[PDB]
Write a protein that binds this ligand. Structure first.
Ligand SMILES: CSc1ccccc1NC(=O)N1CC[C@H](C(N)=O)C1
Ligand SMILES: [Zn+2]
Length: 139
């Protein structure tokens, strides 16, 4: 689990959104596994606006942050799970690193701020849903 809190927005994995996130929906895209809902309080996360390919991610199944190299956002085939059938997920970045299903939501950050959140993984990989192209999170 986990979210990004920027301005009056809450960014979560769409598969982990609550009934309240849907009532307060701003934008969602199943093909990206993202959902953004509105908040009453102002958030303090800064979103990165960059092309960094190295950063640090939080892994809740190890209670540890790991430095990683990751691929640029792209269309990647993601195996079936209890939340989606097998499909291509867009804006996805992959890295070699530990991840378990409950690690979705962990932040990936670079020197510029938040890059994205854990969204896919397995077999020694970890995938992150990019948020750096969502310029409107800033206004
Ligand atoms: C860190 S996710 C993970 C880790 C180990 C094994 C499997 C996984 N995958 C998942 O449980 N999911 C749930 C839906 C998510 C998606 N974006 O399609 C993929
Ligand atoms: Zn950066």
């Amino acid at each position: 689990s986990g979210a990004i809190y920027v301005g009056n927005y809450r960014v979560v994995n769409r598969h982990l959104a609550t009934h309240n996130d849907w009532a307060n929906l701003v934008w969602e895209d199943s093909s990206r596994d993202l959902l953004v809902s509105s908040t009453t309080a102002q958030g303090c996360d800064t979103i990165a606006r960059c092309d960094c390919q190295t950063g640090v991610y939080y892994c809740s199944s190890r209670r540890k942050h790991y430095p990683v190299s990751f691929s640029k956002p792209s269309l990647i085939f993601v195996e079936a799970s209890e939340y989606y059938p097998a499909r291509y997920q867009s804006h996805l970045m992959l890295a070699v690193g530990h991840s378990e299903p409950g690690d979705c939501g962990g932040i990936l950050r670079c020197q510029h701020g938040v890059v994205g959140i854990v969204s896919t993984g397995g077999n020694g990989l970890v995938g992150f849903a990019d948020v750096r192209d969502l310029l409107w999170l800033d206004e």
